[PDB]
Design a protein around this ligand. Structure first.
Ligand SMILES: [Zn+2]
Ligand SMILES: [Zn+2]
Lengths: 124, 337, 38, 145, 123, 48, 97, 131, 102
RNA sequence: UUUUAAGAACUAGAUACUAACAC
RNA sequence: ACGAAUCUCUUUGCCUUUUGGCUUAGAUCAAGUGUAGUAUCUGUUCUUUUCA
RNA sequence: GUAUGUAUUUAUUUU
C-alpha cells in the first residue's frame, strides 16, 4: 500500500499549464535513477496533443530528501539545479552544505531510506 | 521518601488461601513443556511434551483422553481457540501447525520463521494467530489464508512470550535482551518499552480482569499496567530464581514457578508472598530435575496445573480450611528495596 | 572452521528485503473457510 | 511449474530462502536449540556480567559431559559450581531419553523390516551396543554392592 | 539547566504506583471500546491480505478477495488511470529480488533503568 | 529464446525438439545446463 | 619425525591459506615497485581496483560505508569540525609532498 | 612502504575490506570493532570513526568500554562538545552504571567548570542512586 | 579480599584521578560560563583553550603508561615460567591460565 | 647511539614425502 | 616530621593472542614394486687482527 | 580420472 500513499511530488511549471490532466499510475515502475529501488511511475503527456510523454525518474522517498520535482529535478521552490541551489546557499552563510552521495551499490540503496533530508533541502 | 515507606505499613493485604497437592498424573516420557486448557468446558488439558507428542488429559477424572501426535521436534507451546474449535500448537522445527479438533487432525501449516518458535498466542477477538521465536520477530499470521500479514520488528534476542490483548497495545512481548516491548500493530511498530528487568523476561500473564500484565524476570517479578505502561507493584521477591512461568487467576492469586523446585504464590495486589512450596520432585529423579516448566489455572480459578521436568503433571488444590484459623503466611514485613 | 552459532539471523535482516514473486506449492488455497463454535 | 521458471529468469530467485526441518538435517537442529536453551539458564545463574568466554567454555563442559555419558565416564569434574552442575545433569538426562527413546522406536521399526534407511541401520546398532554395555556395567556393580 | 542535562530519565517512573494504595483500579477495556480496535485492525488487515493475494500470479487467486490527486493545489486538476497490462509481458516491469540493509533511524533513547566480592568465590 | 536467454548457446533443439549438446561439455557447463523437469516435460509435450 | 609433527597444528587448508596470502603480498610488492620505477620515469600509472565478485560488491574506500549521523545534541559542536577539516586537509596535503 | 597519497589509499582499502569482512561474519567480537575504530583514528579520519562507533553501539549498548573508548576517541583529538553530547546520550541511556557519571564528572573537573558538576550531581543524586 | 565490584572500583579510580588533577592545579600554583541560543536549541559553552590540552595530554600519557605496563608485562611474564609443555605461544598463555586456576 | 656470523673448502649417500610414470 | 609528585621493583586484584558444534569415538588405519624432482644427517683438512 | 579458484588493458583524460 503505502507506496501510493506519499503522493506524487510534481513541478508546477514543467507539468504544463492546462486546466485538467490525465496521468497513468503504474504500481511498480522503473527503479530510481538514484536509490535503485522500485516505485510507482506516472506517465503523462503534458497536454493531450503532445508528442512526448513525461516520465518520473525517482521515488517519493528519494525526491523528498532532496526536495526536487520528480520529473523536473529542479528544486521545488526555486526552479534550480541542486549543484546550484546548494551552491548559492553555500555562499550565504559561508562554507557548508554539499550532499556527498552514494557510489558503490547498497551504499546508495541503504542511504536512501533514512529521512534526514539533505543540505539543499535542509532549509527549503 | 520515608513517606513511601510509612504507607507500606498500612494497607495490610487481602487474605488469600493456601494450596496443596491433589493429584499426580504421570505418563509423559519427556519433559512437559506447555499446558493450556479449554476456554469453554474445562474437561481437558492439552499438554505439550518433549517426546513431541501432545496428549489430552481429562481434568476431572485424571484419565487419558487422547493422543495428538504429529510433530517432529519437541512441542514448546500450545494455545486453544475460544471462538473456533481449533488448537494452535507450535514446536521448534520452525512450524505453526493449526489443528482441528472436530476430527482430531491437522489442517494448516503456517510457515515462514527463520528458526524455531517459542511462543504462540491467539489474538482474542480478531481471528489472527500471533507467533514469535528465536528469529526475534513477532509475526501476525492471518488465520484463514496463512499469510504472515504483519511481521513485527523488535528486540535483540529470542522472544520468550507474546501476549495478545483485545484493545490497544495489542501485542506484548518480552525478550532475552531484558525488556518488554508493547506493540501497536496497525501503525506497525513499538508503542512503548518497559525496560526495567535486569535479565531475560521469561514469562508474562494477563490479569484476567484488571487489564495488566505480570512480567516475570529471572529473580524479581514486576507487574505492569497497560495504556500508560506504568510500573505498578513489585512483588516482594528475594532471589528465588529462576522464574519459569506466570499464572494469574480469577481471585487474583498469583502463581510463579521456580526452577529450584519452589512454587511461589503471591497475592496480586500486594507483593506479599504467602506460600512457598518444595515440589516433591519424584521417585527416581535427579535432584536437578525438580523444577516447574509451565502453569495454568482452569477457568474456575480453583485448580492448578503444572508440568515438571521430572516427566509428570501435578495438579494443586486450594485448601479451604484456611480462613484465619491458623492460616496466615509470611505476615507482611515490607522491606528495603 | 566449524563454528557453533552463538546466534540466529534476526528477522529484520530479512524484513528489509524486497519480495520475490515465486509461488510455492503448499500455499494453494485450501480449507478456505473457518469454523466457529456455538 | 513454468510460471515459476520464468519469474526466476527475470526477477532472480528468492533472497531469504529459509528452510524447514526434514528427515536428514534433524539432529543439527535438535542439538542447536538444546544448547541454546542451556545457554539461557547458565547465563542467568551467574550473578552479573562475565559471559562470553565463561559461557562458551561452560558449553564445552556441556559437550564434554555428554560424550562422557556415552562412554559411561562417571564425570566428576573436580570442582565447579554446584547449581551449574545441576543444569548439566538435567539436560543430559533430557537428551539421554531422546537417545534411548529413539533407539527403541527404530529397533522396532527394523524388527518389522519396513523400510528403514541405510545408515539408520548402522547407527542403530551403535546406539544399541552402547545401551547393552551400560546395562552390563550396572548389572555387575550391583552384583558388587 | 539541571533539566537540560539528564533530560530524559526522571524518578516518577521508578516509583511503583500500587504501593501507595492497593486497590488502585485500571478498568478492563469495556465493550464499546474493543469493537473499535477490532474495527480499525480488521479493516486494515483485509486491505493487507487483499493486497498480497492480488500481487501474485495465481490466475485463480483473484476470486478469494481514485481521482485522489490534488497536485500542488490541484492547480492543473488530474485523473489517475491505471494502464491495462499486456498480460503476457511482465507484470511489475521493475519488480525484482534484491537485498538491502536498512537505516535504523531514531532521535531518542530508552534509558535502561534498574535498582563482585563474595560471589566470584562461587561462580 | 528461453535457452539462449540462459546463456546456453551450445544446446540445440532440432525441429523435432530433441535437445542435443553440440559441443562436448565442460563440467561447469553441465551444471549450469541441467534443465528443468518442467522444461523437459514441456519439450516432450510440444514434440507430441 | 614426531618432534617435527607435533609442531604444526592446522591441517592442509590453513597452510594453504598462509601461502595464498603471502603470494598476494608478493603481488602487492611487485606491483608497487612497478609503480615506483614508473614514477622514477615520471609517468604515473594508476592502480587497478580489483573488479567485483557479487554484482553489488562494495568498494569501501569510496564512500562512508554506512553513515550514521552521530546524534542530535544540545552542545552545538559546529566549531570542532573546522579544526578537524584543518587537520585533515593539513595531513593529506602534507603526505602528497 | 608508503610513498604518496595513492599508496596510503590502497593500504586503507585493503584493510577496510578485510576487517569489515571479519565484522560482516561476526556482528559480535566487540574487540574487533574496537581495534577497527582504533585503526580508523590512526588514519586521522574522525567522521568514519564516529560512524563506526555508532554502528558498534547499535550492535550492543550494554557494553560500556565501547562507550568509554568512544569518549576518549573524542577527547584524544581534543574536541570536547562531541564528548559532551555523547555523555548526555550516555548517562541518559545508562543511569544505573557509575563509570559514565564519574567520567563525565572528571571531564568537567579537569575543565574546572563547576556549574555543570553542581547540576550534574543534582541529577545523579536526585535518582536515589546509593551511598 | 579480593574482587572489587565494578562500582566501588569506578569510585576509587575517580579518587585517584581526583588527587592527580589536584597535583595538576596545585602544582600549577607551585611552579608559579554557559550561553544558550534563543534561535535554536543548541547550547554554547566557553572554555579556556588551556586545560583542554592538559586534559588530552594527560589522557595520552595514561594510555602510554598503561600500554607500557602491559608490554613489559608481556616480556617478563613470557620469559619467566619454564615448566609446562609448550607447543606454541598459546599453550604458554592458556596453560598458564590453568596454572592460574588452583 | 645500536649489531656481529667462528670462517673456508672437500665428501658420500640414509631415512624421507610425493609420481594423471613402468606390471 | 609527615603532606604531595616522578621513576623503579615486589605482592594482591582483574587475565588481557587464554581450546568455538553435531552424527555410528563420524567411519576406516596398512603389508607392494624401479626410477626421478626436492627437503637434511654426518666426516675430514686448514686459518683466531687493522688502514687508503 | 577430477570438481574449485586466480589473472588475462587493446584504443596516450589537460599541470
Ligand atoms: Zn516537474
Ligand atoms: Zn528511490
Amino acid at each position: 500500500d503505502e507506496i501510493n500513499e506519499p503522493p506524487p511530488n510534481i513541478c508546477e511549471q514543467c507539468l504544463g499549464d492546462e486546466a485538467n490532466i490525465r496521468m497513468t499510475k503504474i504500481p511498480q515502475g522503473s527503479e530510481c535513477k538514484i536509490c535503485t529501488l522500485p516505485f510507482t511511475l506516472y506517465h503523462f503527456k503534458t497536454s493531450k496533443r503532445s508528442n512526448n510523454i513525461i516520465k518520473t525518474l525517482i521515488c517519493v522517498r528519494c525526491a523528498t530528501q532532496r526536495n526536487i520535482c520528480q520529473c523536473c529535478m529542479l528544486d521545488s521552490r526555486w526552479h534550480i539545479p541542486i549543484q546550484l541551489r546548494d551552491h548559492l546557499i553555500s555562499l550565504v552563510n559561508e562554507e557548508n552544505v554539499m550532499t556527498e552521495e552514494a557510489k558503490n551499490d547498497m551504499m546508495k540503496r541503504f542511504l536512501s531510506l533514512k529521512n534526514v533530508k539533505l543540505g539543499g533541502a535542509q532549509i527549503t | 521518601i520515608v513517606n513511601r515507606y510509612e504507607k507500606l505499613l498500612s494497607q495490610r493485604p487481602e487474605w488469600h488461601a493456601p494450596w496443596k497437592l491433589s493429584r499426580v498424573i504421570n505418563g509423559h516420557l519427556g519433559w512437559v513443556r506447555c499446558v493450556a486448557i479449554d476456554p469453554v468446558d474445562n474437561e481437558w488439558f492439552i499438554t505439550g511434551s518433549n517426546d513431541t507428542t501432545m496428549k489430552v488429559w481429562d481434568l476431572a477424572t485424571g484419565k487419558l483422553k487422547t493422543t495428538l501426535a504429529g510433530h517432529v521436534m519437541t512441542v514448546r507451546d500450545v494455545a486453544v481457540s475460544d471462538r473456533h474449535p481449533y488448537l494452535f500448537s507450535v514446536s521448534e522445527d520452525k512450524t505453526v501447525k493449526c489443528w482441528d479438533l472436530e476430527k482430531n487432525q491437522i489442517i494448516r501449516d503456517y510457515y515462514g520463521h527463520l528458526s524455531g518458535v517459542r511462543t504462540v498466542s491467539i489474538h482474542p477477538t480478531l481471528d489472527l494467530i500471533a507467533t514469535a521465536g528465536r528469529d526475534s520477530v513477532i509475526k501476525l499470521w492471518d488465520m484463514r489464508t496463512r499469510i504472515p500479514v504483519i511481521t513485527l520488528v523488535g528486540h535483540k534476542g529470542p522472544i520468550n512470550q507474546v501476549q495478545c490483548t483485545p484493545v490497544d497495545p495489542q501485542v506484548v512481548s518480552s525478550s532475552t535482551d531484558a525488556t518488554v516491548r508493547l506493540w501497536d500493530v496497525v501503525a506497525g511498530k513499538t508503542m512503548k518499552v518497559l525496560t526495567h528487568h535486569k535479565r531475560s523476561v521469561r514469562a508474562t500473564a494477563l490479569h484476567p480482569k484488571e487489564f495488566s500484565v505480570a512480567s516475570a524476570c529471572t529473580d524479581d517479578i514486576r507487574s505492569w499496567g497497560l495504556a500508560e505502561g506504568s510500573l505498578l507493584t513489585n512483588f516482594e521477591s528475594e532471589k528465588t530464581g529462576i522464574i519459569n512461568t506466570l499464572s494469574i487467576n480469577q481471585d487474583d492469586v498469583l502463581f510463579a514457578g521456580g526452577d529450584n523446585g519452589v512454587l511461589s504464590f503471591y497475592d496480586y495486589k500486594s507483593g506479599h508472598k504467602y506460600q512457598s512450596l518444595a515440589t516433591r520432585e519424584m521417585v527416581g529423579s535427579l535432584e536437578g530435575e525438580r523444577s516447574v516448566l509451565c502453569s495454568t489455572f482452569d477457568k474456575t480459578g480453583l485448580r492448578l496445573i503444572t508440568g515438571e521436568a521430572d516427566k509428570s503433571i501435578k495438579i494443586w488444590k486450594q485448601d479451604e480450611t484456611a480462613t484465619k484459623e491458623s492460616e496466615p503466611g509470611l505476615a507482611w514485613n515490607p522491606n528495603l528495596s | 572452521s566449524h563454528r557453533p552459532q552463538l546466534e540466529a539471523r534476526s528477522g529484520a535482516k530479512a524484513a528489509a528485503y524486497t519480495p520475490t514473486g515465486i509461488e510455492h506449492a503448499r500455499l494453494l488455497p485450501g480449507h478456505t473457510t473457518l469454523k466457529y463454535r456455538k | 511449474y513454468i510460471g515459476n521458471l520464468i519469474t526466476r529468469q527475470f526477477e532472480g530467485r528468492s533472497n531469504e530462502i529459509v528452510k524447514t526441518t526434514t528427515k536428514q538435517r534433524l539432529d543439527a537442529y535438535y542439538d542447536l536449540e538444546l544448547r541454546n536453551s542451556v545457554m539461557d539458564d547458565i547465563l542467568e545463574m551467574m550473578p552479573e556480567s562475565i559471559r562470553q568466554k565463561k559461557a562458551r567454555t561452560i558449553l564445552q563442559h556441556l559437550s564434554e559431559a555428554w560424550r562422557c555419558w556415552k562412554a559411561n565416564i562417571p564425570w566428576d569434574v573436580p570442582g565447579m559450581p554446584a547449581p551449574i552442575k545441576k543444569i548439566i545433569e538435567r539436560y543430559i538426562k533430557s537428551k539421554a531419553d531422546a537417545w534411548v527413546s529413539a533407539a527403541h522406536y527404530n529397533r522396532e521399526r527394523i524388527k518389522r523390516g519396513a523400510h528403514v534407511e541405510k545408515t539408520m541401520v548402522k547407527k542403530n546398532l551403535g546406539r544399541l551396543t552402547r545401551l547393552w554395555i551400560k546395562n552390563e556395567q550396572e548389572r555387575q556393580r550391583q552384583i558388587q554392592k | 539547566l539541571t533539566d537540560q542535562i539528564a533530560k530524559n530519565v526522571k524518578l516518577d517512573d521508578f516509583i511503583p504506583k500500587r504501593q501507595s494504595n492497593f486497590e488502585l483500579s485500571v478498568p478492563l477495556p469495556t465493550k464499546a471500546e474493543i469493537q473499535e480496535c477490532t474495527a480499525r485492525t480488521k479493516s486494515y488487515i483485509q486491505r493487507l491480505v487483499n493486497a498480497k493475494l492480488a500481487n501474485s500470479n495465481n490466475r485463480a487467486s483473484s476470486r478469494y478477495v481514485a481521482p485522489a490527486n490534488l497536485l500542488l493545489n490541484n492547480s492543473h486538476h488530474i485523473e489517475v488511470v491505471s494502464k491495462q497490462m499486456d498480460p503476457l509481458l511482465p507484470r511489475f516491469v521493475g519488480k525484482k529480488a534484491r537485498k538491502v540493509v536498512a537505516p535504523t533511524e531514531n532521535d531518542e533513547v530508552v534509558p535502561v533503568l534498574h535498582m563482585g566480592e563474595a560471589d566470584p568465590n562461587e561462580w | 529464446l528461453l535457452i539462449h536467454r540462459k546463456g546456453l548457446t551450445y544446446l540445440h533443439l532440432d525441429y523435432n525438439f530433441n535437445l542435443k549438446p553440440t559441443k562436448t561439455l565442460t563440467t561447469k557447463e553441465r551444471k549450469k545446463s541441467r534443465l528443468g523437469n518442467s522444461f523437459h516435460l514441456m519439450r516432450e509435450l510440444l514434440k507430441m | 619425525e614426531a618432534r617435527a609433527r607435533l609442531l604444526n597444528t592446522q591441517g592442509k587448508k590453513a597452510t594453504r591459506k598462509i601461502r595464498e596470502r603471502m603470494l598476494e603480498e608478493s603481488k602487492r610488492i611487485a606491483e608497487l615497485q612497478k609503480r615506483r620505477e614508473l614514477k622514477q620515469a615520471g609517468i604515473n600509472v594508476a592502480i587497478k581496483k580489483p573488479k567485483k565478485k557479487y554484482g553489488t560488491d562494495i568498494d569501501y574506500n569510496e564512500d562512508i560505508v554506512y553513515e550514521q549521523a552521530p546524534m542530535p545534541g544540545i552542545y552545538d559542536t559546529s566549531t570542532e569540525d573546522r579544526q578537524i577539516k584543518k587537520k585533515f586537509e593539513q595531513f593529506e596535503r602534507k603526505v602528497n609532498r | 612502504d608508503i610513498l604518496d597519497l595513492e599508496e596510503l589509499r590502497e593500504y586503507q582499502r585493503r584493510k577496510r575490506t578485510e576487517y569489515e569482512g571479519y565484522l560482516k561474519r561476526n556482528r559480535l567480537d566487540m574487540g574487533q570493532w574496537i581495534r577497527y575504530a582504533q585503526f580508523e583514528i590512526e588514519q586521522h579520519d574522525m567522521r568514519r570513526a564516529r560512524s563506526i562507533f555508532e554502528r558498534a553501539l547499535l550492535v550492543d549498548s550494554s557494553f560500556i568500554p565501547l562507550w568509554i573508548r568512544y569518549i576518549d576517541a573524542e577527547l584524544k583529538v581534543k574536541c570536547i562538545n562531541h564528548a559532551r553530547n555523547l555523555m548526555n546520550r550516555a548517562i541518559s541511556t545508562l543511569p544505573r552504571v557509575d563509570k559514565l557519571w564519574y567520567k563525565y564528572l572528571i571531564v568537567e573537573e579537569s575543565l574546572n567548570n563547576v556549574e555543570i558538576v553542581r547540576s550534574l550531581y543534582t541529577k545523579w543524586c536526585s535518582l536515589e542512586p546509593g551511598v | 579480599r579480593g574482587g572489587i565490584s565494578y562500582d566501588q572500583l569506578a569510585k576509587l579510580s575517580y579518587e585517584k584521578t581526583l588527587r592527580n588533577l589536584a597535583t595538576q592545579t596545585q602544582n600549577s600554583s607551585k611552579q608559579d560560563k554557559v550561553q544558550k541560543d534563543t534561535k535554536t536549541g543548541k547550547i554554547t559553552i566557553a572554555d579556556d583553550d588551556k586545560l583542554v590540552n592538559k586534559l588530552a595530554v594527560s589522557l595520552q600519557s595514561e594510555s602510554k603508561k598503561r600500554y607500557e605496563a602491559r608490554k613489559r608485562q608481556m616480556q617478563n611474564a613470557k620469559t619467566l615460567y619454564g615448566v609446562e609443555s609448550f607447543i606454541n605461544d598459546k599453550n604458554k598463555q592458556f596453560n598458564e591460565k590453568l596454572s592460574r586456576e588452583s
